[PDB]
Amino acid sequence: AFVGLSDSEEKLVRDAWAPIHGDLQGTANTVFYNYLKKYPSNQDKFETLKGHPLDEVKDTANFKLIAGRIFTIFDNCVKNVGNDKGFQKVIADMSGPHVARPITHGSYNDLRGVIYDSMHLDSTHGAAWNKMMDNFFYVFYECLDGRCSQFS
Ligand code: HEM
């Protein structure tokens, strides 16, 4: 279920994200690359990337757009980490385009893990980050299951 964060935890989440917030596109590019390199079955899910070598698409406009859009959603979630309706709406709106897509929970969680690993958080910041991400994927997975309206 969705579990609100305390004020101190909300601050911890902003602080944890601050390095990435200050280099959002560059971080996105590296993390998305590392995700597709470690879990290459996912590259085919992106029709604009399908059928080319990863190293051949990594430097392209389309690649960078996709990485950017993922990280902009997380950036807006962090922005709304103190506003549960706002946070839920950011996710609800991005969920629609994924509902029909054949993407496993495993694939989504593999991305979460690449992001976690890149951030190298201490356990206090990590605990707060994981409270936010647990909210993120509870809202997302409810929406993928056609129960998005509960957050409206
Ligand atoms: C859980 C973090 C994720 C976020 C925040 C996110 C966000 C977004 C956003 C903002 C878009 C653009 C609007 C649209 O959907 O067309 C997009 C599209 C898309 N996403 Fe995600 N996404 C996530 C995970 C994934 C994963 C793990 C996959 C595949 C393994 C995936 C596959 C897609 C596909 C295939 C599209 C359209 C691709 C194209 O332009 O070729 N998404 N996503």
Coordinates of all heavy atoms in Angstrom, one line a residue, residues 32 35-36 39 41-50 62 65-75 77 90-91 93-99 101-112 115 133 136-137 140-141, ligand 1:
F32 N 20.6 4.4 -18.2 CA 19.8 3.7 -19.2 C 20.7 2.8 -20.1 O 20.3 1.7 -20.3 CB 19.0 4.7 -20.2 CG 18.0 4.1 -21.1 CD1 17.1 3.2 -20.6 CD2 18.0 4.4 -22.4 CE1 16.1 2.6 -21.4 CE2 17.0 3.8 -23.3 CZ 16.1 2.9 -22.7
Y35 N 21.6 -0.1 -17.9 CA 20.4 -1.0 -17.8 C 20.3 -1.9 -19.0 O 20.1 -3.2 -18.9 CB 19.2 -0.2 -17.6 CG 17.9 -1.0 -17.7 CD1 17.5 -1.8 -16.7 CD2 17.0 -0.7 -18.7 CE1 16.3 -2.5 -16.7 CE2 15.7 -1.4 -18.7 CZ 15.4 -2.3 -17.7 OH 14.2 -2.9 -17.8
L36 N 20.4 -1.4 -20.2 CA 20.3 -2.1 -21.4 C 21.5 -3.0 -21.7 O 21.3 -4.1 -22.3 CB 20.0 -1.2 -22.6 CG 18.6 -0.4 -22.7 CD1 18.5 0.3 -24.0 CD2 17.4 -1.3 -22.4
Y39 N 20.9 -5.9 -18.9 CA 19.7 -6.6 -19.2 C 19.2 -6.4 -20.6 O 18.2 -5.7 -20.9 CB 18.5 -6.2 -18.2 CG 19.0 -6.2 -16.7 CD1 19.4 -5.1 -16.1 CD2 18.9 -7.4 -15.9 CE1 19.7 -5.1 -14.7 CE2 19.3 -7.4 -14.6 CZ 19.7 -6.3 -14.0 OH 20.0 -6.3 -12.7
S41 N 17.7 -8.0 -23.0 CA 16.3 -8.4 -23.4 C 15.4 -7.2 -23.5 O 14.5 -7.1 -24.3 CB 15.7 -9.5 -22.5 OG 15.4 -8.9 -21.3
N42 N 15.7 -6.2 -22.7 CA 14.8 -5.0 -22.7 C 15.0 -4.0 -23.9 O 14.1 -3.3 -24.2 CB 15.0 -4.2 -21.3 CG 14.6 -5.0 -20.2 OD1 13.4 -5.3 -20.0 ND2 15.5 -5.5 -19.3
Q43 N 16.1 -4.1 -24.6 CA 16.3 -3.2 -25.7 C 15.2 -3.3 -26.7 O 14.7 -2.3 -27.2 CB 17.7 -3.3 -26.3 CG 17.9 -2.2 -27.4 CD 19.3 -2.2 -28.0 OE1 20.3 -2.6 -27.3 NE2 19.5 -1.7 -29.2
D44 N 14.8 -4.6 -27.0 CA 13.7 -4.8 -28.0 C 12.3 -4.2 -27.6 O 11.5 -4.1 -28.5 CB 13.6 -6.3 -28.2 CG 14.6 -6.9 -29.2 OD1 15.3 -6.1 -29.8 OD2 14.6 -8.1 -29.3
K45 N 12.1 -3.9 -26.3 CA 10.8 -3.3 -25.9 C 10.7 -1.9 -26.5 O 9.5 -1.4 -26.7 CB 10.7 -3.3 -24.4 CG 10.9 -4.7 -23.8 CD 9.7 -5.6 -24.2 CE 9.8 -7.1 -23.6 NZ 10.7 -7.1 -22.5
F46 N 11.8 -1.3 -26.8 CA 11.8 0.1 -27.4 C 11.9 0.0 -28.9 O 13.0 -0.2 -29.4 CB 13.0 0.9 -26.8 CG 12.9 1.0 -25.3 CD1 13.5 0.1 -24.5 CD2 12.2 2.1 -24.7 CE1 13.4 0.2 -23.1 CE2 12.1 2.2 -23.3 CZ 12.7 1.2 -22.5
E47 N 10.8 0.3 -29.6 CA 10.8 0.0 -31.0 C 11.8 0.8 -31.8 O 12.3 0.4 -32.8 CB 9.3 0.2 -31.6 CG 8.3 -0.9 -31.0 CD 8.5 -2.3 -31.6 OE1 9.2 -2.4 -32.6 OE2 7.9 -3.2 -31.0
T48 N 12.1 2.0 -31.3 CA 13.1 2.9 -32.0 C 14.5 2.4 -31.9 O 15.4 2.8 -32.6 CB 13.0 4.4 -31.5 OG1 13.3 4.4 -30.1 CG2 11.6 4.9 -31.8
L49 N 14.8 1.5 -30.9 CA 16.1 1.0 -30.6 C 16.3 -0.5 -31.1 O 17.4 -1.0 -31.2 CB 16.3 1.0 -29.1 CG 16.1 2.3 -28.3 CD1 16.5 2.2 -26.8 CD2 17.0 3.4 -29.0
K50 N 15.2 -1.1 -31.3 CA 15.1 -2.5 -31.7 C 15.9 -2.8 -33.0 O 15.8 -2.0 -34.0 CB 13.7 -3.0 -31.9 CG 13.4 -4.4 -32.2 CD 11.9 -4.7 -32.0 CE 11.5 -5.9 -32.8 NZ 10.1 -6.2 -32.5
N62 N 17.4 9.6 -30.3 CA 16.2 8.8 -29.8 C 16.6 8.1 -28.4 O 15.7 8.0 -27.6 CB 15.9 7.7 -30.8 CG 14.5 7.9 -31.3 OD1 14.2 8.1 -32.4 ND2 13.6 7.7 -30.3
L65 N 16.5 10.8 -25.7 CA 15.2 11.2 -25.4 C 14.5 10.2 -24.5 O 13.8 10.5 -23.5 CB 14.3 11.3 -26.7 CG 14.6 12.5 -27.6 CD1 13.9 12.2 -28.9 CD2 14.1 13.8 -27.0
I66 N 14.6 8.9 -24.8 CA 14.0 7.8 -23.9 C 14.6 7.9 -22.5 O 13.8 7.9 -21.5 CB 14.2 6.4 -24.5 CG1 13.4 6.3 -25.9 CG2 13.7 5.3 -23.5 CD1 13.8 5.0 -26.7
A67 N 15.9 8.0 -22.4 CA 16.5 8.0 -21.1 C 16.0 9.2 -20.3 O 15.7 9.1 -19.2 CB 18.1 8.0 -21.2
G68 N 16.0 10.4 -21.0 CA 15.6 11.6 -20.4 C 14.2 11.5 -19.9 O 13.9 12.1 -18.8
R69 N 13.2 10.9 -20.6 CA 11.8 10.9 -20.2 C 11.7 10.1 -18.9 O 10.9 10.4 -18.1 CB 10.9 10.4 -21.3 CG 11.0 11.4 -22.5 CD 10.0 11.1 -23.6 NE 8.7 11.5 -23.1 CZ 7.6 11.6 -23.9 NH1 7.7 11.3 -25.2 NH2 6.5 11.9 -23.4
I70 N 12.4 8.9 -18.8 CA 12.4 8.2 -17.6 C 12.8 9.0 -16.4 O 12.1 9.1 -15.4 CB 13.3 6.9 -17.7 CG1 12.8 5.9 -18.7 CG2 13.5 6.3 -16.3 CD1 13.9 4.8 -19.0
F71 N 13.9 9.7 -16.6 CA 14.5 10.4 -15.5 C 13.7 11.7 -15.1 O 13.7 12.1 -13.9 CB 16.0 10.7 -15.7 CG 16.9 9.6 -15.1 CD1 16.8 8.3 -15.7 CD2 17.7 9.8 -14.1 CE1 17.6 7.3 -15.2 CE2 18.4 8.8 -13.5 CZ 18.4 7.5 -14.1
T72 N 13.1 12.3 -16.1 CA 12.2 13.4 -15.8 C 11.0 13.0 -15.0 O 10.6 13.8 -14.1 CB 11.8 14.1 -17.1 OG1 12.9 14.7 -17.7 CG2 10.7 15.2 -16.8
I73 N 10.4 11.8 -15.2 CA 9.4 11.4 -14.3 C 9.9 11.2 -12.9 O 9.3 11.6 -11.9 CB 8.8 10.0 -14.8 CG1 8.1 10.2 -16.1 CG2 7.9 9.4 -13.7 CD1 6.8 11.1 -16.1
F74 N 11.0 10.5 -12.7 CA 11.6 10.4 -11.3 C 11.9 11.8 -10.7 O 11.6 12.0 -9.5 CB 12.8 9.5 -11.4 CG 12.5 8.0 -11.4 CD1 13.0 7.2 -12.5 CD2 11.6 7.5 -10.5 CE1 12.6 5.9 -12.5 CE2 11.3 6.1 -10.6 CZ 11.8 5.3 -11.6
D75 N 12.4 12.7 -11.5 CA 12.7 14.0 -11.0 C 11.4 14.7 -10.5 O 11.4 15.3 -9.5 CB 13.3 14.9 -12.2 CG 14.0 16.1 -11.6 OD1 14.9 16.0 -10.7 OD2 13.7 17.3 -12.1
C77 N 8.6 13.1 -9.5 CA 8.2 12.3 -8.3 C 9.0 12.9 -7.1 O 8.3 13.1 -6.1 CB 8.5 10.8 -8.5 SG 7.3 10.0 -9.6
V90 N 1.7 12.1 -11.1 CA 2.8 12.0 -12.0 C 2.9 10.6 -12.6 O 3.1 10.3 -13.7 CB 4.2 12.4 -11.3 CG1 5.4 12.1 -12.2 CG2 4.2 14.0 -11.1
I91 N 2.7 9.6 -11.6 CA 2.9 8.2 -12.0 C 1.6 7.7 -12.8 O 1.8 7.0 -13.8 CB 3.0 7.3 -10.7 CG1 4.3 7.6 -9.9 CG2 2.9 5.8 -11.1 CD1 4.3 7.1 -8.5
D93 N -0.3 9.4 -14.8 CA -0.2 9.9 -16.1 C 0.8 9.1 -17.0 O 0.5 8.8 -18.1 CB 0.1 11.4 -16.1 CG -1.1 12.3 -15.7 OD1 -2.2 11.7 -15.6 OD2 -0.9 13.5 -15.4
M94 N 2.0 8.8 -16.4 CA 3.0 8.1 -17.2 C 2.6 6.6 -17.3 O 3.1 5.9 -18.2 CB 4.4 8.2 -16.6 CG 4.7 7.8 -15.2 SD 4.7 6.0 -14.9 CE 5.7 5.5 -16.3
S95 N 1.7 6.0 -16.5 CA 1.4 4.6 -16.5 C 0.6 4.2 -17.8 O 0.8 3.1 -18.3 CB 0.6 4.2 -15.2 OG -0.8 4.7 -15.3
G96 N -0.3 5.1 -18.3 CA -1.1 4.7 -19.4 C -0.4 4.1 -20.6 O -0.8 3.0 -21.0
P97 N 0.6 4.8 -21.1 CA 1.4 4.2 -22.2 C 2.1 2.9 -21.9 O 2.4 2.2 -22.9 CB 2.4 5.3 -22.5 CG 1.8 6.6 -22.0 CD 1.0 6.2 -20.8
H98 N 2.3 2.5 -20.7 CA 2.8 1.2 -20.3 C 1.8 0.1 -20.1 O 2.2 -1.1 -20.2 CB 3.7 1.3 -19.0 CG 4.8 2.2 -19.2 ND1 4.7 3.6 -19.0 CD2 6.1 2.0 -19.5 CE1 5.9 4.2 -19.3 NE2 6.8 3.2 -19.5
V99 N 0.6 0.4 -19.9 CA -0.5 -0.6 -19.6 C -0.5 -1.7 -20.6 O -0.5 -2.9 -20.2 CB -1.9 0.0 -19.4 CG1 -2.9 -1.1 -19.2 CG2 -1.9 1.0 -18.3
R101 N 1.9 -2.5 -22.8 CA 3.2 -3.0 -23.1 C 3.5 -4.3 -22.3 O 3.3 -4.5 -21.1 CB 4.3 -2.0 -22.8 CG 4.3 -0.7 -23.8 CD 5.2 0.4 -23.3 NE 5.1 1.6 -24.2 CZ 5.1 2.9 -23.7 NH1 5.1 3.2 -22.5 NH2 5.1 3.9 -24.7
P102 N 4.1 -5.3 -23.1 CA 4.5 -6.6 -22.5 C 5.8 -6.5 -21.7 O 6.9 -6.9 -22.2 CB 4.6 -7.5 -23.6 CG 5.0 -6.7 -24.7 CD 4.3 -5.3 -24.5
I103 N 5.8 -5.8 -20.6 CA 7.0 -5.6 -19.8 C 6.8 -6.2 -18.4 O 5.7 -5.9 -17.8 CB 7.3 -4.0 -19.7 CG1 7.6 -3.5 -21.1 CG2 8.5 -3.8 -18.7 CD1 7.5 -2.0 -21.2
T104 N 7.7 -7.0 -17.9 CA 7.5 -7.7 -16.7 C 7.8 -6.8 -15.5 O 8.5 -5.8 -15.6 CB 8.4 -9.0 -16.5 OG1 9.8 -8.6 -16.5 CG2 8.1 -10.0 -17.6
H105 N 7.2 -7.2 -14.3 CA 7.6 -6.5 -13.1 C 9.2 -6.7 -12.9 O 9.8 -5.8 -12.4 CB 6.9 -7.1 -11.9 CG 5.4 -6.7 -11.9 ND1 4.7 -6.8 -10.7 CD2 4.6 -6.2 -12.8 CE1 3.4 -6.4 -11.0 NE2 3.4 -6.0 -12.3
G106 N 9.7 -7.9 -13.3 CA 11.1 -8.1 -13.2 C 11.9 -7.0 -13.9 O 12.9 -6.4 -13.4
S107 N 11.5 -6.7 -15.2 CA 12.2 -5.6 -16.0 C 12.2 -4.2 -15.3 O 13.1 -3.5 -15.2 CB 11.6 -5.5 -17.3 OG 11.9 -6.6 -18.2
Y108 N 11.0 -3.9 -14.8 CA 10.8 -2.6 -14.1 C 11.7 -2.6 -12.8 O 12.4 -1.6 -12.5 CB 9.3 -2.4 -13.7 CG 8.4 -2.1 -14.8 CD1 7.3 -2.9 -15.1 CD2 8.7 -1.1 -15.7 CE1 6.4 -2.6 -16.1 CE2 7.8 -0.8 -16.8 CZ 6.7 -1.6 -17.0 OH 5.8 -1.3 -18.0
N109 N 11.7 -3.7 -12.1 CA 12.5 -3.7 -10.8 C 14.0 -3.8 -11.1 O 14.8 -3.3 -10.3 CB 12.1 -4.9 -10.0 CG 10.6 -4.9 -9.6 OD1 10.0 -3.9 -9.6 ND2 10.1 -6.1 -9.3
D110 N 14.4 -4.4 -12.3 CA 15.8 -4.4 -12.7 C 16.3 -2.9 -12.9 O 17.4 -2.6 -12.5 CB 16.0 -5.2 -13.9 CG 15.9 -6.7 -13.6 OD1 16.0 -7.1 -12.5 OD2 15.7 -7.5 -14.6
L111 N 15.4 -2.1 -13.4 CA 15.7 -0.7 -13.6 C 15.9 0.1 -12.3 O 16.8 0.8 -12.1 CB 14.6 0.1 -14.5 CG 14.8 1.6 -14.7 CD1 16.2 1.9 -15.3 CD2 13.7 2.1 -15.6
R112 N 14.9 -0.2 -11.4 CA 15.0 0.4 -10.0 C 16.4 0.0 -9.4 O 17.0 0.9 -8.8 CB 13.9 -0.2 -9.2 CG 14.0 0.1 -7.7 CD 12.9 -0.5 -6.8 NE 13.1 -0.1 -5.4 CZ 12.2 -0.1 -4.5 NH1 10.9 -0.6 -4.8 NH2 12.4 0.2 -3.2
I115 N 19.3 2.1 -10.9 CA 19.2 3.4 -10.3 C 19.8 3.4 -8.9 O 20.6 4.2 -8.5 CB 17.8 4.0 -10.3 CG1 17.4 4.3 -11.8 CG2 17.7 5.3 -9.5 CD1 15.9 4.6 -12.0
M133 N 10.4 4.8 -3.4 CA 10.3 3.9 -4.6 C 9.3 2.8 -4.4 O 8.6 2.4 -5.3 CB 11.7 3.2 -4.9 CG 12.7 4.2 -5.6 SD 12.0 4.7 -7.2 CE 13.1 3.7 -8.3
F136 N 6.3 4.5 -5.4 CA 6.3 4.6 -6.8 C 5.8 3.3 -7.4 O 4.8 3.4 -8.2 CB 7.7 4.9 -7.3 CG 7.8 5.0 -8.8 CD1 7.7 6.3 -9.4 CD2 7.9 3.9 -9.7 CE1 7.8 6.5 -10.8 CE2 7.9 4.1 -11.0 CZ 7.8 5.3 -11.6
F137 N 6.4 2.2 -7.1 CA 5.9 1.0 -7.8 C 4.5 0.5 -7.2 O 3.7 -0.1 -8.0 CB 7.0 -0.1 -7.6 CG 8.1 0.1 -8.6 CD1 9.2 0.8 -8.1 CD2 8.0 -0.3 -9.9 CE1 10.3 1.0 -9.1 CE2 9.0 -0.1 -10.8 CZ 10.2 0.6 -10.4
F140 N 2.3 2.6 -9.5 CA 2.5 2.2 -10.9 C 1.9 0.8 -11.2 O 1.1 0.7 -12.1 CB 4.0 2.1 -11.1 CG 4.4 1.8 -12.6 CD1 3.9 2.6 -13.6 CD2 5.2 0.8 -12.9 CE1 4.3 2.4 -14.9 CE2 5.7 0.5 -14.2 CZ 5.2 1.3 -15.2
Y141 N 2.1 -0.2 -10.3 CA 1.6 -1.5 -10.5 C 0.0 -1.6 -10.3 O -0.6 -2.3 -11.1 CB 2.3 -2.5 -9.6 CG 3.7 -2.8 -10.0 CD1 4.6 -3.4 -9.1 CD2 4.2 -2.5 -11.3 CE1 5.9 -3.7 -9.5 CE2 5.5 -2.9 -11.7 CZ 6.4 -3.4 -10.7 OH 7.7 -3.7 -11.1
Ligands
HEM1 C1 9.7 2.4 -14.0 C2 10.4 3.6 -14.6 C3 9.9 4.1 -15.9 C4 9.4 5.4 -16.2 C5 9.4 6.6 -15.2 C6 9.0 5.5 -17.6 C7 8.6 6.6 -18.2 C8 8.2 6.7 -19.5 C9 7.8 7.9 -20.2 C10 7.7 9.3 -19.5 C11 7.5 7.5 -21.5 C12 7.1 8.5 -22.6 C13 5.6 8.4 -22.9 C14 5.2 7.1 -23.4 O1 5.1 6.2 -22.6 O2 5.1 7.0 -24.7 C15 7.8 6.1 -21.7 C16 7.5 5.3 -22.8 C17 8.0 4.0 -23.0 N1 8.5 3.2 -22.1 FE1 8.8 3.7 -20.1 N2 9.2 4.2 -18.1 C18 9.7 3.4 -17.2 C19 10.1 2.1 -17.4 C20 10.1 1.4 -18.6 C21 10.7 0.1 -18.8 C22 11.5 -0.7 -17.7 C23 10.5 -0.2 -20.1 C24 11.0 -1.4 -21.0 C25 11.7 -2.5 -20.5 C26 9.7 0.9 -20.7 C27 9.3 0.9 -22.0 C28 8.7 2.0 -22.6 C29 8.3 2.0 -24.1 C30 8.7 0.8 -25.0 C31 8.0 3.3 -24.3 C32 7.9 4.0 -25.8 C33 9.3 3.8 -26.6 C34 9.8 4.5 -27.9 O3 9.8 5.7 -28.0 O4 10.4 3.7 -28.7 N3 9.5 1.8 -19.8 N4 8.2 5.7 -20.4

